[PDB]
Every structure is written in structure tokens, then in C-alpha cells.
Amino acid sequence: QQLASFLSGTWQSGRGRSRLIHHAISGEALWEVTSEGLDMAAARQFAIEKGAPALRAMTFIERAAMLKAVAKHLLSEKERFYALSAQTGATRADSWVDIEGGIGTLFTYASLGSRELPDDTLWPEDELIPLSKEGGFAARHLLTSKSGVAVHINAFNFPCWGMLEKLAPTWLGGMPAIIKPATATAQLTQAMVKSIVDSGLVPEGAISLICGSAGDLLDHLDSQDVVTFTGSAATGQMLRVQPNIVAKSIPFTMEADSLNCCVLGEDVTPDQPEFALFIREVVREMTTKAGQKCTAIRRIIVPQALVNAVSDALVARLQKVVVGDPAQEGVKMGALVNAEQRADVQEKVNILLAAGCEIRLGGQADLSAAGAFFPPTLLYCPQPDETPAVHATEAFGPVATLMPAQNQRHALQLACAGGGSLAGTLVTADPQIARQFIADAARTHGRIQILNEESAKESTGHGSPLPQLVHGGPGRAGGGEELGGLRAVKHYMQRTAVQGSPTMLAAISKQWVRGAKVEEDRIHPFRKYFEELQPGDSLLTPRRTMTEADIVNFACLSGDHFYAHMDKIAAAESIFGERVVHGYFVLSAAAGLFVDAGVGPVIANYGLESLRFIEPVKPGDTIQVRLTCKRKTLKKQRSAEEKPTGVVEWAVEVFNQHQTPVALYSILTLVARQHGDF
Amino acid sequence: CLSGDHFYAHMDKIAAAESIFGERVVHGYFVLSAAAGLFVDAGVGPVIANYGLESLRFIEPVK
Amino acid sequence: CLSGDHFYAHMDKIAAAESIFGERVVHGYFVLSAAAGLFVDAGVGPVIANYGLESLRFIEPVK
Amino acid sequence: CLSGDHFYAHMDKIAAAESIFGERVVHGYFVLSAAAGLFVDAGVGPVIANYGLESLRFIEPVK
């Protein structure tokens, strides 16, 4: 039963030197894996010539809708994935975090995209940048999709989450993906790829899968492609100097092994709740997935006094963890994935012991039994700041080292001695301690959890990367960045500054910008349905002359008797030099000048985005408004009965009688559409 | 009356009945202005200018 | 504000500058209403209903 | 308040209860003014003057 690869649209396999996938618990070889003789160049050319233009023709809203449909279809079929994850050595909670975290990543990126990305194939990321006096020359930054293919070389830790946390921003960015999982657990990636492909939900050529070796694929990549790697540091650093990748300047992101720490604060004493939640946190991070996640705690740093109490409590809670076959009721932590992995963990543990670490709880495994079980291992380091191997050696299993600190600053130095980590945790009750810790140690950590009694109730964990937070770190952790919300989407696009006149930039952006040509229609823009509106549709309102009576009436009705409006004496020695009109009255009277009263397509306002009061408005001044439709964004119908709407941003400009702007802002609205799309 | 905004969701009982809210509601800008009225200190002091309002969302209708 | 009539001859000094009058004037309907306010007796009496206005001309602008 | 007309049919609940309408009603002149506020176009245009009203009858009371 050889595991197939999905490239060039065909499920196929290879022939030659294979590799076997064994069952983590029983030890039997239940899959063999090979991809020799497969045409990698044809697979890349298939991804780029038909997958990429298909994905690039969709708007960001359509791609977010596709992510959501795929997430739902994957969610329905999750039982198959759970049954396959059983073969990897995982309890049901571990498989839960993997499966449902991957699918939740899809759902989160779908929501984020549909909520924040333009209804277009281009993405203007900032506002218009003015670059001249008269306004004929400006610039803004645009993001467009790269034309190549994204190759994702994943690790065995999270065969589903690791694929989907990269796949979601890749598609949202408009790029096809070629996925190469780790051979040791590729059977679980294959089934998810088959679900996605047999759903018919995604364009053709938008997903490819290489089970086995990548062959000469990297030699065929050009500068419009991207590569991501998760795994050991030697393999990643070898890929980073691949001659083709360096010659063509192909973006390369590496994520490697890190020594994640967990510091206990000096303020913490054993009679506090922080002590108990610290113990629980260390143990959960040590034993989830048998400590096989890249964010598992490897270094425990406590104050010198607390050392013996902490070491009592850790082994106490850690002896009640039953290692065994999770199919048997009573097991709380399963096996590693391989006898090879178990050998590597034992060999790292032996390195640490030879480098001067004392065993507090079992460190020797059964190097001949069938299942790849390892006992929870807790080590001790008596001399932390002269034993360099404890900050460099990472045993990829249920293994951690306890070590003592001093004076609340030695602990910071110890935390930073990791050389760059993915995740760190500080258990404390004092906010000043947490501030000092962040200020000193954020530069060597990608993510830091401050864990006190209040956050502990809903905290997601030290080891769980959330889709909205960056996942990565400097130095030993690889230097890469993932999962930062839309930051990860931008990793698959090109940022380009575009200079020109505001009308050219408005046409390039498909959004109206300041100083661009408008169009007037003698039909009020509020009477138009979403489809009949265009960016740049504009209305000049009639005028309203400000009076002292307006200042008085507004101040009375609102209750705002600030001296700059109601006190002639105090206003005389202000910067304006006399009484002025309220900013909020300019806002309200502008709404009064442009809002169409009758029932129409405009449903709600609900939003005002960036208001600045430029110049004072005085009694005797006369204001006039221009209302220009600035940006449109369709909203997908989530049902069959909800009324189809879209979001329209409107630029508002308030001028006085010298044509000088006195207020600038934008309003958001909901505008009914004529045609829904179920 | 003072602002000139006679949008039907505030001034037309019939049309407001078949809106999503289901009746007439208060203007968002009046909630804004009355909030300023509740918190602004009137006398001369260290505060010199407002000049800016940064990210306003109207969450729930006020009746 | 109360009536909703923001015709430029009353509310826009720039447009009223090049009107026939040359400045902002008072609404004719407010002249009518203020006149009613000046002559109408408030308390219960023999006058029962008003119900009618017959031939109204506005002769000269009120400033 | 603004016009000064405090005829009991609008401002006195006790006297209005004993009237033909049976409760307080809206001023006819306010119906006239608010109607002008509903139909008058504010901005500069072809309409130059108003100056005249011809045959006003108040048919039904407005509550």
C-alpha cells in the first residue's frame, strides 16, 4: 500500500528506494513512501500555468469564501482524520488540537479576509501619500500576488495544522501551493489533500502534494516562488544555501528547534495560586503529544529558594501521568511517532546527562519495545550559567530541565541564553516584573505569555500558536515568521509603490483618492443601489452659514459648554482668539447637509473612521460639503433569506467659503444590493 | 432639527417599523455629542484642543 | 431648524448675497406664525376653531 | 414656544379634553411649515420666490 502523490492533476507514485511508515504503538509498517521518477518540473509548470491564474482571477472575498467552504467540508469528514491520527501515537486531545486547530485556522483566515480585504484582485494597503504642493503627484503602496508557486516543506509534529496554517495565507494571497510533508506522518496529510481535491471546491492546480522526496524541484524554481521549511536546523540551513534559491533570490522562511523557557517570578510563593498554575502549565506543556510540539517547555527557570519545592511538585504531578496505548482507558499520554525519534530523544538526553545534568525523574526508555513510548523525564542543572549545553541541546520529547536563578535578573539572562526561542512564559502577579521581563527578553522570543490568576481561566496555553499571533523567532528558532493575521498573507505578495496623479491612482486602485476626478449625476448618491454606485460618484451639497445661535443651541442641546465656545473672555486669550463652533456640530450639520431623508438603499451608518478638525469655524463662516463614494466591498450572503448588502466607505470633505477644508473624514455604511448570490 | 438630519430611521415611525431596529432610534452623532457633554470639563484648564476622533463604531441602537 | 426649510434665501449668506434682497431674510411662514403668536388669546373663550387662511401675499422682505 | 401661540387647544390638556377634538392637537401653521420643510429644495435653483398662499383649509386635526 504505497502512498500516492498528487501532482499535475494525477494521483501517482514513485519507484525505487522507499521509506516505511510504522505504527507508533504496534510498530508494524503500514505504509511505504517513495516519489522517484516523478516529473517535478511538470508539477511546478502545472501549478503555475493553470492553478495560479485561476486563483488570481478571484477577488479576495471569493478566496475567503473558498477558504470557508473548504473548512466546512474538512470539518464534516474529521472522523477519518482522527482514525488516521490514531496511527501516529496521539491521544484524542492531541489529535483534537491538530485537526480542529488546522480547520479553525482556515475559519479564522476566512473571517479575517472577508472582513478586512478589498473586493478586488489588487490590495491597496495604505492611504494616499501626498508628494507635492498643488496635488498633481502622489503615491500609495499596492500588494499584488506573486505569479509563482509556494512550496511548503512541513515537519511531522502537526501533519494537519502545519499544512493548513501555511495553506490558508497562501491561497488568500493568490498562490498555488506544493506541499511536501515529513515522510514519518505523510499518510495524514494525504487524506486531507484528498478531501480538499475531491470536494471540487478549489481551482484546478491550486494544491499539489509530494509524498516522499522533493527530487530536483528546488532547482526548477524561479524568483516568483517562495519556500517555507519547518524541521531540524541542519536540513533547513542546507536548503537556505541551495544554489538555485540563492541565485534567483527566492524568499526562504525557516522554522527550527527552539529551547522554550518558563520563568517563575520572584514574587511567587508556594501558598499562592500562581504556584499551582505554574506547575500545571509546565506539566501540560511537557506531556501534550508526549512533548513533541515545537513550543514545548524545555527549560524551567525558578528562583534558588523555590527549587526544591518546585522539583517536589513537578515529579509529584508528573508521576500520575499514565503512559500507554491511548485506545486503552486510563492513558493520558501516548507514544512518540518512531523508534528513530525515540532513539534521538534518548541520545539527546544522554548528551545532557554527560554535560552535567541530574535525573529527577526517569530518563531511560525501552529502546527495544514495540511502541515508541518515552517516560516523562525531568532533569536538573545545578550550574546553569556555566553549562552551555543546556541552552543548546533540545530533546524532542517529554523532557525538560529545571534550573535555579538569582536576584530576578539572572533569570532574565538565563531566559535570553536560549539563543532565540519561539515561546516563553512568565508566571507572576506583579505587573512591574512582567514589564521588566518583556523589555529585556522580548528581543529573543517570538511569543511571550504572562500567566497570572486572571489570565489562567481562559488562557489558550504556552504551546498553542493562535492564528492571529505571529509564530516564529530569531536565531536558533530560524528567523522566520508565520501566522500573524494578514502579515502571513503578505508573505505571498509583492509590495509596490505606485506614483502618479490622483486620478491615475484612483483608477489603479479602483478606489477614489483625495484629488482624483469625480463624477456628478444629478441623482443623489444615496438613492443608488450597491451595483449602481461607482467610486468617485460625488455630490456637492447646498451651503449652511454658521451663526452665534448655532453655537448656543448646540452647546445647550449637547451639554458641552467648553470655554472655547461659551466664554468670550477666555476665548480671547486662546489660540483661535475668539469663540468658535463645536467640531461635533460641524460633523452633525455636515450629515444634515448630505443625508437623504427618504427610504432608500442606504441602511446604516454605524461608523466614522478618521476625523481631523483642520481649521476653526467661526460665526459668519459658511460651510459646504462634498460627499464622494470612496470604496465598495460586497458582503457574501450567509443564508438564503438575509438581504444582500455591501459596505461603502464615503469620503466627506467640509469646506468653508474660502474653499479651505475645515474637516476631513470617512463614513462607513451598509447599502442594499439589487442581486443577491444565495 | 438642529443638525438637519431627518433620516427616516429617526423621524418616520412608519418606515422605522419595517427597519431592522423596529422603531425610531437616536442619532449616532447625538450619542457622540451628548457623551462629550457628559465628560467635557467646561472651565479653563490644561486641555487645549480636541481636534481628532479616531475610531468610532455604533454598536447597538439607543432608544 | 424646527420646520425643516433650509432654503438658501434664509440659511446661505453667499447665495443670498446675489439674491434680489441682497441678504438673508426671515421665512414668510415664520412671519405668519409670529403674527398668530402676537394676536391669539390663549385662554378658553368664544373662539373655537381657526381652520382657514384665505389670501396671503408677502409684500416686503422682513430682515 | 417659538411662535408664541399658546392656544388652549395645543397647550392645555384639561381644556383640550373638553374641546371638540378631545385632546391636544398640532398647530395648523406648524403643519403648513413642516410641509414646506418636507418639499422645499434647499439649494440655488430656478425657484426664485414664494410670496403667496391661496386657499388653506385645515380639514382634519393632526395629533
Side-chain angles (χ1 to χ4, degrees):
Chain A
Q1 205 191 34
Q2 61 186 357
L3 204 72
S5 296
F6 183 74
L7 52 90
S8 294
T10 301
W11 290 100
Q12 49 196 281
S13 296
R15 287 173 305 203
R17 297 283 70 74
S18 292
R19 297 194 37 69
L20 272 294
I21 296 175
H22 303 290
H23 206 277
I25 310 307
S26 68
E28 66 195 318
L30 75 166
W31 296 96
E32 61 91 14
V33 171
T34 178
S35 67
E36 211 195 328
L38 291 203
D39 195 346
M40 297 311 183
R44 177 189 164 263
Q45 202 70 233
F46 184 87
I48 66 157
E49 268 161 332
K50 78 175 48 62
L55 277 168
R56 276 200 272 102
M58 314 168 68
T59 53
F60 284 104
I61 305 298
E62 280 154 350
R63 306 203 275 241
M66 169 182 86
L67 291 202
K68 192 180 206 186
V70 164
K72 276 166 309 188
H73 175 270
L74 284 176
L75 198 45
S76 69
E77 304 179 10
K78 74 196 174 71
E79 293 313 317
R80 165 181 319 113
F81 308 138
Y82 274 106
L84 279 165
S85 177
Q87 312 174 338
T88 73
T91 69
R92 273 273 307 194
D94 296 331
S95 65
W96 178 86
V97 311
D98 188 40
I99 304 304
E100 315 266 353
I103 301 178
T105 300
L106 284 189
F107 269 128
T108 295
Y109 267 91
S111 158
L112 218 61
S114 80
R115 198 174 68 247
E116 312 181 274
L117 284 163
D119 191 4
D120 193 8
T121 54
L122 279 55
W123 179 8
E125 71 162 354
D126 51 46
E127 297 292 282
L128 183 75
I129 313 160
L131 297 167
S132 55
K133 316 261 185 84
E134 281 88 3
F137 184 67
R140 64 190 319 202
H141 287 102
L142 318 177
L143 295 149
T144 68
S145 312
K146 293 181 176 177
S147 60
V149 65
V151 178
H152 294 317
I153 297 157
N154 291 354
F156 76 86
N157 295 321
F158 278 117
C160 304
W161 171 93
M163 176 177 84
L164 290 176
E165 65 93 18
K166 291 172 182 172
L167 190 46
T170 310
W171 284 346
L172 199 47
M175 285 192 77
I178 291 164
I179 304 195
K180 168 184 155 60
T183 190
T185 312
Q187 82 256 26
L188 183 48
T189 307
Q190 200 209 24
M192 191 161 280
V193 176
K194 199 183 305 285
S195 294
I196 294 159
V197 166
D198 285 297
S199 78
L201 281 165
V202 310
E204 194 65 29
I207 175 64
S208 280
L209 170 70
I210 305 183
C211 289
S213 171
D216 53 290
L217 174 60
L218 305 175
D219 288 329
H220 293 299
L221 296 185
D222 73 350
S223 75
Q224 287 283 307
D225 310 300
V226 311
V227 194
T228 66
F229 176 86
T230 312
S232 86
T235 311
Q237 284 166 7
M238 179 85 230
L239 291 194
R240 164 180 280 151
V241 301
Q242 151 78 27
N244 182 41
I245 286 175
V246 311
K248 303 285 183 66
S249 294
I250 298 179
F252 173 81
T253 283
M254 189 182 77
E255 200 260 305
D257 63 279
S258 71
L259 282 88
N260 314 307
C261 76
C262 195
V263 174
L264 190 65
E266 184 179 0
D267 53 288
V268 173
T269 62
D271 51 88
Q272 312 187 356
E274 275 84 4
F275 194 83
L277 55 82
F278 174 75
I279 293 298
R280 200 262 299 280
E281 188 63 27
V282 164
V283 171
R284 177 178 61 194
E285 296 315 323
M286 272 188 62
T287 78
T288 290
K289 298 187 80 71
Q292 266 172 333
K293 58 178 72 175
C294 49
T295 43
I297 297 182
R298 314 300 184 184
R299 299 182 302 142
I300 312 160
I301 303 158
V302 303
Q304 177 54 265
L306 271 297
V307 168
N308 293 130
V310 158
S311 161
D312 300 345
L314 284 173
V315 308
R317 185 177 173 87
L318 209 64
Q319 291 196 292
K320 296 185 291 294
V321 170
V322 182
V323 178
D325 188 353
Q328 295 294 319
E329 300 301 9
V331 176
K332 285 158 83 65
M333 173 183 130
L336 306 181
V337 305
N338 284 316
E340 292 202 350
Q341 274 290 304
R342 198 186 48 200
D344 177 77
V345 178
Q346 185 71 75
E347 193 268 333
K348 300 300 183 149
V349 161
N350 296 329
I351 284 154
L352 267 174
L353 298 171
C357 293
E358 294 179 355
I359 292 171
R360 288 277 188 277
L361 194 51
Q364 186 63 38
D366 285 338
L367 293 173
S368 64
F373 301 100
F374 211 92
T377 301
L378 167 67
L379 297 191
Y380 187 74
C381 180
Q383 297 296 322
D385 59 358
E386 63 91 22
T387 316
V390 75
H391 308 297
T393 301
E394 190 266 323
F396 209 69
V399 177
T401 297
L402 177 46
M403 60 184 69
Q406 318 172 194
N407 73 21
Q408 187 36 248
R409 178 177 321 289
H410 191 221
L412 264 52
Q413 302 186 331
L414 280 176
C416 292
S421 299
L422 297 154
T425 299
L426 166 82
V427 168
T428 193
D430 193 0
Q432 288 321 282
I433 288 291
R435 208 274 173 194
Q436 283 163 330
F437 180 81
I438 290 299
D440 287 271
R443 74 180 37 96
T444 74
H445 286 78
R447 176 154 64 77
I448 292 194
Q449 190 190 4
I450 308 293
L451 180 55
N452 69 344
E453 185 182 354
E454 174 178 357
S455 81
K457 187 260 212 183
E458 303 201 67
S459 179
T460 75
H462 163 103
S464 295
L466 304 182
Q468 306 99 307
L469 310 188
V470 291
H471 178 69
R476 181 174 309 281
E481 212 188 80
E482 297 170 334
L483 287 188
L486 302 174
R487 302 170 178 89
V489 184
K490 294 166 208 231
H491 301 332
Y492 307 93
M493 304 183 85
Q494 174 72 40
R495 170 180 292 103
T496 300
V498 186
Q499 298 169 296
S501 77
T503 67
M504 282 289 185
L505 288 168
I508 281 156
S509 297
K510 281 69 59 187
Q511 297 165 2
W512 187 84
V513 297
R514 178 103 52 232
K517 154 186 78 66
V518 298
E519 297 299 327
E520 309 172 3
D521 205 284
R522 86 278 178 275
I523 296 310
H524 196 295
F526 275 19
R527 283 155 204 229
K528 296 172 162 156
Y529 287 89
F530 183 88
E531 294 95 357
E532 314 172 277
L533 277 166
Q534 298 305 300
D537 289 332
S538 200
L539 168 80
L540 193 68
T541 72
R543 301 188 271 252
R544 178 163 179 186
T545 287
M546 306 284 95
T547 52
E548 200 186 38
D550 293 306
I551 302 191
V552 179
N553 297 332
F554 188 81
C556 280
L557 177 60
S558 65
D560 184 11
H561 296 282
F562 191 67
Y563 66 92
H565 323 291
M566 290 309 262
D567 180 6
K568 186 179 182 179
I569 303 170
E573 67 267 13
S574 72
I575 57 171
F576 298 140
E578 58 185 359
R579 275 160 319 160
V580 295
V581 178
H582 304 68
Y584 291 167
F585 180 70
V586 172
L587 188 68
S588 307
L593 282 169
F594 71 73
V595 165
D596 193 64
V599 162
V602 170
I603 296 169
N605 295 109
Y606 78 90
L608 184 156
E609 180 59 27
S610 64
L611 169 67
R612 295 291 176 275
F613 293 114
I614 315 167
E615 317 286 327
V617 184
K618 284 151 173 30
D621 287 346
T622 302
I623 63 149
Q624 183 167 38
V625 181
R626 181 173 292 281
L627 177 69
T628 311
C629 167
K630 169 173 165 80
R631 170 188 162 163
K632 304 165 52 189
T633 295
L634 186 137
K635 284 173 74 160
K636 301 284 210 155
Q637 279 177 300
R638 61 184 71 257
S639 297
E641 69 273 15
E642 271 307 311
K643 303 196 210 204
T645 58
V647 174
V648 181
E649 194 175 342
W650 305 79
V652 183
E653 292 158 320
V654 189
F655 306 93
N656 65 8
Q657 68 271 0
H658 313 106
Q659 275 56 242
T660 311
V662 299
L664 302 165
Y665 58 103
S666 312
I667 55 163
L668 307 183
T669 64
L670 256 68
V671 178
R673 312 199 262 124
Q674 286 165 305
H675 310 291
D677 51 31
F678 70 78
Chain B
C1 280
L2 176 60
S3 65
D5 184 11
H6 297 282
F7 191 68
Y8 66 92
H10 321 291
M11 291 298 267
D12 179 7
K13 186 179 183 179
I14 303 168
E18 67 267 13
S19 73
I20 57 171
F21 297 141
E23 57 184 359
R24 277 159 317 158
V25 295
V26 178
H27 304 68
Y29 291 167
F30 180 68
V31 172
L32 188 67
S33 307
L38 283 168
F39 70 73
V40 165
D41 194 64
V44 163
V47 169
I48 298 170
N50 285 32
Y51 85 82
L53 183 155
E54 180 59 27
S55 64
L56 170 66
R57 295 293 176 274
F58 292 115
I59 313 160
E60 321 277 338
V62 184
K63 284 150 173 30
Chain C
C1 280
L2 179 50
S3 79
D5 179 7
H6 301 283
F7 190 70
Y8 64 91
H10 314 124
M11 290 304 266
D12 178 9
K13 176 154 68 176
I14 290 144
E18 66 267 15
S19 82
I20 298 90
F21 299 137
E23 58 183 358
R24 277 165 303 151
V25 304
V26 176
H27 305 69
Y29 285 169
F30 176 68
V31 172
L32 187 68
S33 281
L38 286 176
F39 67 74
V40 164
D41 198 60
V44 170
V47 178
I48 296 172
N50 203 309
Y51 79 91
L53 187 165
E54 183 51 34
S55 44
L56 170 59
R57 294 298 176 269
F58 288 113
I59 306 159
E60 316 285 337
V62 179
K63 280 146 175 54
Chain D
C1 281
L2 176 55
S3 71
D5 185 5
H6 303 263
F7 194 62
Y8 66 91
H10 326 294
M11 293 304 269
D12 182 359
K13 183 190 222 164
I14 291 140
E18 293 138 35
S19 77
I20 189 167
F21 295 144
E23 58 183 0
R24 282 168 295 139
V25 308
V26 179
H27 300 77
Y29 287 168
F30 183 56
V31 172
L32 178 67
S33 307
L38 288 173
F39 67 79
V40 163
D41 202 66
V44 165
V47 170
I48 288 165
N50 201 329
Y51 79 88
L53 182 161
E54 292 298 328
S55 65
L56 167 63
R57 296 293 180 274
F58 295 106
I59 313 192
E60 306 303 311
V62 176
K63 301 171 171 71

